[PDB]
């Protein structure tokens, strides 16, 4: 009988594929392209969750809020934390949402720091080995290869942006999801709205970023695969700074497209963001 695994988003699901391979039955709740903060699970997701031998969720205020979907899911399914479902973010230095609006809440976009993605993967393989010790061999060899593949990319991101002047190191995305990236890789970031729970693209939010750009003008703006592009397109039209590239934050790309995995989305993000900020 195959181990039944449920991941909450395509990032976590892809991390689990990289470790488990063909040895598990994997279900991803939030489909590719959809927002993982406010996605509403479907009956098939409730069913596969209740029959899951292990569930992996992000935690740190992505889906585990008080009135959030995952908390309702595991409560209604009567699952126990650290026995059935596990937060793959356990063990990272948390960064909180600065906005006085989101008082005290945590920023969930930890995977944008590659070292946290390694922590995510280590937490995934830890529980896969504990519940399916038959395949401890394969989980460890895939984790070891995955961690190394991510470490090389991490060492690359540490010096990817050294050629760009400090007055032009600004990653501008629609959502303020780059906090862990900025801390880890020395590139400040700006946004329209801080988290997808807020209203996305108000005239004040747009006009504030317009003024922010006048002070620190980057060569390029960016837009996420999982957000409506019209807010960032208004900022781009008004500021005159073109959006250099689509980037990947809260979701991987569809099967077949560039960035259709966590590693590929990070290499894509490093490639495109370094390219755009140059000119």
């Amino acid at each position: 009988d195959k181990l039944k695994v449920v991941a909450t988003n395509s990032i976590i699901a892809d991390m689990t594929k990289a470790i488990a391979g063909d040895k598990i039955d994997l279900h991803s709740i939030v489909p590719i392209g959809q927002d993982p903060h406010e996605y509403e699970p479907l009956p098939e997701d409730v069913e596969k969750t209740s029959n899951a031998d292990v569930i992996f969720y992000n935690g740190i205020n992505l889906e585990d809020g008080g009135q959030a979907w995952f908390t309702k899911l595991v409560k209604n399914a009567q699952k126990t934390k650290n026995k059935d479902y596990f937060a793959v973010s356990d063990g990272i230095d948390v960064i909180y949402l600065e906005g006085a609006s989101e008082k005290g809440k945590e920023d969930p976009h930890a995977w944008l720091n590659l070292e946290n993605g390694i922590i995510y993967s280590k937490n995934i393989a830890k529980q896969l080995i504990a519940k399916d010790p038959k395949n401890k061999e394969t989980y460890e060899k895939n984790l070891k290869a995955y961690v190394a593949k991510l470490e090389k990319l991490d060492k690359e991101a540490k010096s990817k942006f050294d050629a760009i002047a400090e007055n032009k190191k600004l990653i501008v995305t629609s959502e303020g999801c780059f906090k862990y990236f900025s801390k880890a890789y020395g590139v400040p970031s700006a946004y329209i709205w801080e988290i997808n729970t807020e209203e996305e693209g108000t005239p004040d939010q747009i006009s504030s970023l317009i003024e922010k750009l006048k002070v620190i003008k980057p060569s390029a703006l960016f837009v996420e695969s999982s957000v409506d592009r019209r807010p960032m397109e208004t900022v781009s039209k008004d500021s005159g700074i073109p959006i250099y590239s689509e980037i990947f934050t809260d979701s991987i790309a569809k099967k077949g497209k560039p960035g259709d995995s966590y590693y590929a989305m990070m290499k894509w993000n490093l490639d495109k963001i370094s390219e755009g900020l140059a000119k």
Partner: single-chain antibody
Amino acid sequence: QSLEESGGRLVTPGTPLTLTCTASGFTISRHHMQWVRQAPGKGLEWIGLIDSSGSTYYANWAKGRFTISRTSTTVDLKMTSLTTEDTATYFCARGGSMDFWGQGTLVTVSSTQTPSPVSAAVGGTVTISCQSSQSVAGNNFLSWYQQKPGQPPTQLIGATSTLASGVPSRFKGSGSGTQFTLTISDLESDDAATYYCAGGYSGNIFAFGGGTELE
């Protein structure tokens, strides 16, 4: 904040027709949308849903005669060949729990879950609307809806025990697996409505029970 259906009209059998659910005050790109019909006098019947990502699921009787598509602002229901038995009011409802519904558009064509009772009645006390399902649902995907006549359904309880915003604890939902129960205490004059029930199943199929009118 609002859903508005359009396109319904009176047609002959075999006439194709397309209905449109237009959203006002929010975007559809991040909500599941269901199409539900209700024949005159008869009860609520689920047709299908379009998942926010784009997947489509339909009832087993659709036979491919009803097709759902979505844009950033509208959801389409393309009926390819209408029969007189398709005479109904066609609603769109948002979300997996069908939180809020449109007013409905009327289509006239011209020339499973069983609630044990059809009716129940008290003055100011307590009534029970019960539910038997053929198969288990996820064990908790059951929802209760109140439908005052000539109005869209209002959702009362989602997930079988969880109240919706602004519904009193007076409405109590219980049950698990196949048997579910809606209990209404402190009965009021405007509790008079036909209380329906909707379950979600494996394969993302939804089904309403028959009515349970209340006095």
